[PDB]
Ligand binder design. Structure first.
Ligand SMILES: *[C@@H]1O[C@H](CO)[C@@H](O[C@@H]2O[C@H](CO)[C@@H](O[C@@H]3O[C@H](CO[C@H]4O[C@H](CO)[C@@H](O)[C@H](O)[C@@H]4O)[C@@H](O)[C@H](O[C@H]4O[C@H](CO)[C@@H](O)[C@H](O)[C@@H]4O)[C@@H]3O)[C@H](O)[C@H]2NC(C)=O)[C@H](O)[C@H]1NC(C)=O
Length: 115
């Protein structure tokens, strides 16, 4: 917890695109930033962004083709995740995990889904 990472309440509707909100203590160079999103009990990653691009070789099957970050906003500390066509199976506890040149941090988020 050497850097600040914060989530805020995030909730979507089933069948519609959603957002999982995460912010962090912003770093100066994009190359120093790593974002990882995890979901409780899930073997693969939800999403990873490293060296200015997505790195999804270890992404869990439940999220293949369904996730994006805001690559233009990572430099200002915006680690929010876009989730395509939210499903009831997406509900649960997520973790936003951040590395910068100044250290690391993480915060959890409870994502809610409903009709
Ligand atoms: C990081 O940078 C981005 C880009 O500028 C900002 O993006 C906006 O984020 C807000 C939420 O903070 C978005 O509004 C939310 O949209 C959700 C649906 O999102 C998907 O679909 C739309 C297209 O229809 C896309 O624009 C979006 O990128 C996703 O693909 C809704 O589910 C949200 O509603 C929920 O939260 C609100 C409170 O925020 C509740 O009141 C609702 O009841 C519900 O629970 C919400 O409406 C907005 O569309 C995004 N804009 C753009 C241009 O993409 C982020 O804000 C920023 N995040 C940081 C800094 O933390």
């Amino acid at each position: 917890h050497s850097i600040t990472v914060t989530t805020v309440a995030s909730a979507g509707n089933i069948g519609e695109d959603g957002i999982l909100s995460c912010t962090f203590e912003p770093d100066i160079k994009l190359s120093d930033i790593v974002i990882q999103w995890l979901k409780e009990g899930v073997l693969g990653l939800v999403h990873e962004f490293k060296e200015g691009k997505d790195e999804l070789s270890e992404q869990d099957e439940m999220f293949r083709g369904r996730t994006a970050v805001f690559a233009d906003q990572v430099i200002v500390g915006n680690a929010s995740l876009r989730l395509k066509n939210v499903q009831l199976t997406d509900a649960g506890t997520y973790k936003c995990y951040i590395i910068t040149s100044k250290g690391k941090g993480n915060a959890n988020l409870e994502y809610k889904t409903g009709h």
